[model samples]
Target: MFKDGSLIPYLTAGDPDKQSTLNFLLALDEYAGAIELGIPFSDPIADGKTIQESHYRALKNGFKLREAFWIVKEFRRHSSTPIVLMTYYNPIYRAGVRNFLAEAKASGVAGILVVDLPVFHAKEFTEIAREEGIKTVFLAAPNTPDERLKVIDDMTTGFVYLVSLYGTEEIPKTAYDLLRRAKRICRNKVAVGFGVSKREHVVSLLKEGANGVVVGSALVKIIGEKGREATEFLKKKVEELLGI
Candidate 1:
């Protein structure tokens, strides 16, 4: 129910190997306000260059739904940071809705963000997620019409993910007005994601009244190249942002 801005980090399960993934997530528990455990899928449409690459590499390395769930279970043992499952619908639907939600909830997942699922086609999925006491988050693109925006806003449980711009996934702009507009329109918490990298970006977003920021590619790239160095860097950055 908090409306203050927070930094939520994203990590690909089984990317550097499952144990490393578990260690990374457990470590991130100390850093981020929440964790977005991305279930590596074969096709990640909404993701941009970096995340798409991660997904493909992990898939090639044999990451699967069961492995992703185990990471959720293992991470839950050490920390509780409102972990959310960020995966595509194809996997969930393939796994069966009831089974998927039961396992997700049991693994300590608080919400599920299906990148492409809209409300019109999401009634059953949302109902199942809600039944498990899991929040359902829907994404709002820049091209979303006013009426559709309201529909999306209504369906979201925790908050509406507002994408600043439309082209693939990139970092948010330095301009304050873009975020301010989202704040004005959203009744529930408006969590902004996509292309938020530096602390200045986080600072700018916090000032403009965002409920939270999701930095995917930037953080993921650090994890990809620098390994633990990237993890430690992001860990301290988020803690510093929170003044913890």
Candidate 2:
């Protein structure tokens, strides 16, 4: 997906169960650029309404960090399509950031994206990831001003997540003009996410100079509605988008 300006999809770890999570990851790895495994946390402040609801359901369904690790370990078997563990900062603090990064490295994870850790407060996490040889990516929202954007760019590795819209829930239009402005200022790889799910979204981002796009709610919504069918359906959608 990263090679041709495609969408990098995300799914919460253990949304249904551990085995189903493994199945989803195996199927998604075939076409996704980087699969974001969202670890279910009680307090997910950075996420939007839909995502927060997903978190609640995930926890209610017995999802946890260990299950998230199990998903990553299982995902490593089928493809190395860059597994990124997306979690809130509390879990990292609870598990010890250094210990978590070390375990993540051993599990074959490519990067870490903690939603609550802003650039200014990322010292401990970044230091640990750097020491453990793991890529650390950060999100830059539309509200992020020029000064903080620079710091975000500096702290980000692999790529900076450029949120194309304001709210967390899906929106119809991506802020192409603001994204273009961000692209002009960003020094590293900039991936446009949020309110981006379709091929047209990806094509527009590519034209606007973004390195990639991330899709989350769309896939999760599919899973919630279609169960296992969401796997093949999403794969077909990605293939159709990439013309593969």
Candidate 3:
């Protein structure tokens, strides 16, 4: 965990193509402390328009959960940066929990953050992931109750994802409050996500004592528009954000 803050960029696997995706990950890994790798899902309800489209593009290009594991395996062969897979539960259910955990462990995945899985409902999966040496990350919102926050903090291993309010790029006061509160309870780290784009956003979170910032829509939007040039665009964005 970075005491100041770490840059965590998100990208959908196999978006433009398999090789391009690998190159993009490598480029972002140059600056990012961790990368949030989204396994292409049919419905990404938690994501904005940009990331949803990226998921569709990846799925259309024949990227499935199995292929995502292979991509992680390939990436692990080159980079040792931490990778947290942002996925929904459907794919895991279809793939069989034990099988998915075994494969994800073999692929060198560091953490698993399931968007729709409630912390209260994640005991089995969380234990299994823990057994495989994978951190099971959970999400918390500004409005979440203190009791629930305790549960989320307790269950989360790598970090608790603090989601800012939707459709806005700024982290509101409520989010900062949540981060401060989470920091008191969580032994690991607390990373802010949802609508974080610019470098200033990251700096502000760090100043507020967040462990990291998850840059998703802003980064994914660039890839959605730039195609093959996405790698360079992402590289520049990450370098600028991380001040490299």
Candidate 4:
């Protein structure tokens, strides 16, 4: 699903509303190799301020977790873009892993990234996801040891998410070393994300051997600012930011 210069755009499901979320999905489908749709949670510690607020709005609007399935189901009617849900573990745990995986599969989701679930603790979840034919995305931080990086690569059925930093920010010159290291260490695609908001960042990362680039916060920030009017601006911004 990844390629050189591949760009993955993310959104908080039901951020403004279900129809708007689907509109964003459709607007983004042409440029995105895959779309990373996040399920809103009460606490999204891994996300930066921009995404956290989007999640808050979704939750505040009484967007149930199950409604994410309905949104994806509607999106699948129009496009085949792979949807990877970036979520926390508790919701899935409470929903029952088996049932969650079943609903995810039936809803046309392609993969998932359980942020708080460490790779070591994800064996059973990934196993069930495998049975459901859903890819399991695992994260790798810059501080991670080479051995652990290898283990994350081994554990992840989906692309290895090469995190640039702890909290979201633009890619730094220093982050390129981790990109080189992860590209060398990971046999699977090493997709870099976190604060990748500009065209230069995308070009530089892809040139440095990142298999894919994930842009979230900057886009989410736009949605936060414009709620119902974010789609057109986002579409134009996506093309401008990902000229690749």
**What lDDT does each candidate get?**
0.73, 0.74, 0.81, 0.84
**Cα error of candidate 2 at position 76, Å:** 0.9
Query: Stretches of candidate 2 above 4 Å error?
Result: 1-4, 118-120, 164-174, 240-244
Q: lDDT per residue, candidate 2, 89-202, as tens digits?
A: 888888988899899989888999988874456887788798898998888777777777787778777678776436433333435645766777777777776665556656
Which residue pairs collide, candidate 2?
Answer: none
Weakest ten-residue segment in model 4 by summed lDDT:
165-174
Ranking by lDDT: 4, 3, 2, 1
The candidate scoring highest on TM-score is 4
Cα RMSD to the true fold for all candidates: 2.8, 2.6, 1.8, 1.7
lDDT of 4 by residue, 12-115 (tens): 99889888898899999989888889999999887778888999999998889988999899999999988898889989989998899889989999998888
Candidate 3: deviation at residue 229, Å?
A: 2.0
Q: Candidate 4: which pairs clash?
A: none
lDDT of 2 at 45: 72
Per-residue lDDT of candidate 1, residues 1-244 (tens digit):
2336667777888776677778777766755677788888787877877888888777887887788888888888888788888888888888888798888988788888898775466888888888888897778766666676677777888777776443322243523444565566667787777466566667777777877877666667766787545657666656654556
Ranking by TM-score: 4, 3, 2, 1
Top-lDDT candidate index: 4
Indicate the residue-level lDDT of 106 in model 2: 91
> What lDDT score goes with residue 90 in model 3?
87
lDDT of 2 at 91: 87
